[PDB]
């Protein structure tokens, strides 16, 4: 389909403060509540906070490098959801789904023309 | 009395240990170990479920009698029953009433031979194929696979009918005299597929006439939907015309600036 050039506004993931230093601290973001914290204050040479400023365009949200918005597909019955919205959304088959039913979902998709985003399972 | 079985006195400051309670005695290795606190290993947990607790909710009896009325109303109305998750197919009309000679059925060949003729055995086939798993640890205490809740069958009196339908997966017998939400609207989802008997079905106007405190609930509207009311010419003549927003230009307005 037709759309804008996709542009992300931030490239990388946000780290928690002091997470680089310590293995106990996981690098998933947490808003710092320290009273004397430099980070809460926003001094220079701290990372910028995640916030509604960084929100991507309402058109291009959840959109892949390809073009299509990935809906997850768990079975043959769930593939009926993408019949209406054919060239806006696109399929993404689950990791649980085994090698036999993988081939059946591809064969069903090539009939109905739904682009499957999962790639190179192998064999 | 759990976790407080141990002795424990809390040492004090001076020893460069935290002031938490510590079990006393010597040589066990257990001794000199923190105990009696929620954070300690084998301490009393923070407020686990008590008998003190209120378990049962006294739900008002008018509102109980309201809900069995609305669930029986919803057992008609063929949008709702398939919107739960049924395979009623054809015939598509609901409810299904059945002649009272079926109430004398004894053996289960006849009860299965009933359901496929009236066209309900699609919903029994939905139970038999396609079992449903318990992802959780609940498997240790209550059976690894659940079963689907299929049709429902109602009779005023039992003549071995209960024995006949018992043992077929997914069908739940009730008397008309009882009735219940757990049967009629399971998981608070109205419209289960009901197979009435004639003697059950003809009782219902007798039942709900002569119930003591309850009386039968009114609606606020007279109609089902609005769209007939607005589109009528009685309303439409009075309305103003439907407006729509102009988008505004971004730009020499004036006809002669060159006089200046």
């Amino acid at each position: 389909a037709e759309h804008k050039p996709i542009i992300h506004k931030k490239t990388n993931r946000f780290h928690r403060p002091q997470s680089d230093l310590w293995n106990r601290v996981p690098s998933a973001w947490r808003h710092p509540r320290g009273i004397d914290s430099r980070f809460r204050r926003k001094y220079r040479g701290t990372p910028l906070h995640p916030s509604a400023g960084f929100g991507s365009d309402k058109e291009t949200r959840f959109m892949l490098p390809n073009g299509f918005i990935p809906v997850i597909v768990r079975s043959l019955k769930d593939l009926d959801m993408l019949l209406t919205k054919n060239t806006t959304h696109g399929a993404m088959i689950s990791a649980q789904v085994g090698a036999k039913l993988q081939q059946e979902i591809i064969k069903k998709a090539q009939e109905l023309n739904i682009e499957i985003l999962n790639q190179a399972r192998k064999h | 009395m759990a976790g407080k079985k141990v002795s424990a006195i809390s040492w004090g400051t001076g020893r460069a240990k935290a002031c938490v309670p510590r079990v006393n005695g010597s040589g066990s290795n257990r001794n000199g170990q923190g105990a009696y606190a929620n954070f300690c290993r084998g301490g009393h947990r923070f407020n686990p479920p008590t008998l003190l607790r209120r378990w049962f909710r006294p739900v008002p009896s008018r509102q109980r009698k309201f809900a069995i009325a609305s669930a029986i109303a919803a057992t008609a109305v063929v949008p709702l029953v398939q919107a739960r998750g049924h395979v009623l197919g054809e015939v598509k009309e609901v409810p299904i009433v059945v002649v009272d000679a079926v109430q004398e059925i004894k053996r289960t060949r006849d009860a299965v031979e009933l359901l496929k003729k009236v066209g309900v055995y699609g919903d029994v086939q939905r139970v038999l194929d396609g079992s449903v798993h318990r992802s959780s640890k609940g498997k240790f205490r209550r059976a690894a696979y659940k079963t689907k809740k299929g049709p429902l069958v109602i009779y005023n009196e039992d003549k071995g009918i209960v024995k006949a339908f018992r043992n077929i997966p997914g069908v739940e017998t009730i008397s008309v005299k009882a009735l219940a939400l757990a049967k009629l609207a399971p998981a608070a989802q109205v419209g289960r597929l009901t197979v009435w008997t004639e003697s059950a079905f003809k009782a219902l106007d007798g039942i709900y006439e002569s119930k003591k405190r309850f009386s039968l609930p009114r609606s606020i509207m007279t109609n089902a939907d609005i769209e007939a009311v607005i589109t009528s010419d009685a309303v439409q003549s009075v309305l103003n015309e439907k407006k729509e927003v102009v988008p505004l230009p971004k730009c020499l307005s004036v006809g002669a600036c060159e006089d200046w």
Binding site: - | S215, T222, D225, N240
Partner: protein, 185 residues
């Protein structure tokens, strides 16, 4: 940098907080009219359906007989509330009424004297303009909780009724309430 006062002092209820079909439905009927016809009557009926159940006070049937005494026939008493019958009123007049619900005692009384029992979606066909209608409302302060509201008791004179389980002597009648025991409020 701009000098404004960013705070909101006043919220107002826009749509109803009920999770019914029917109250939400016939709100949108009278919301649709209140916009489009551009009229003071339908704007009020729209807003009355928004407001909580405490403010929709139950307008009793003897108050309905007093309002309509004088007013000629083909005049509906529109009323965004429940109607409840009076024991003490004896012979009801023949009267045309519209409300959300009646009590089953009151509906028997109005119908038995040749009256009418009209719904709001029924009324939207009949009278979109509200010509020869009559909006009525119960008084807001008739609730018992409302008597506890006001200046704190003991302000000389609050007349506000202190929050008490048990009445009589012994419970809150001495040092404060009477001038013998030091002072009177």
């Amino acid at each position: 940098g701009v000098d404004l006062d960013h705070r909101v002092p006043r919220k107002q209820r826009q749509e109803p907080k009920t999770a019914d079909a029917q109250m939400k439905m016939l709100h949108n009927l009278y919301a649709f009219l209140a916009r489009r016809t551009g009229n003071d009557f339908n704007a009020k009926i729209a807003h009355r359906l928004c407001i909580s159940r405490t403010n929709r006070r139950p307008y009793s049937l003897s108050r309905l007989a007093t309002a309509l005494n004088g007013k000629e026939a083909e005049t509906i008493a529109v009323l965004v509330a429940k109607i409840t019958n009076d024991e003490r009123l004896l012979e009801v007049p023949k009267m045309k009424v519209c409300a959300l619900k009646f009590t089953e005692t009151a509906r028997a009384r109005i119908l038995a004297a040749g009256g009418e029992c009209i719904t709001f979606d029924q009324l939207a066909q009949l009278r979109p303009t509200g010509d020869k209608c009559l909006l009525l409302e119960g008084d807001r302060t008739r609730r018992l909780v409302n008597k506890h509201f006001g200046a704190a008791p003991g302000d000389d004179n609050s007349k506000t009724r202190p929050k008490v389980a048990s009445h009589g002597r012994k419970f809150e009648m001495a040092r404060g309430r009477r001038k013998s025991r030091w002072y009177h409020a």
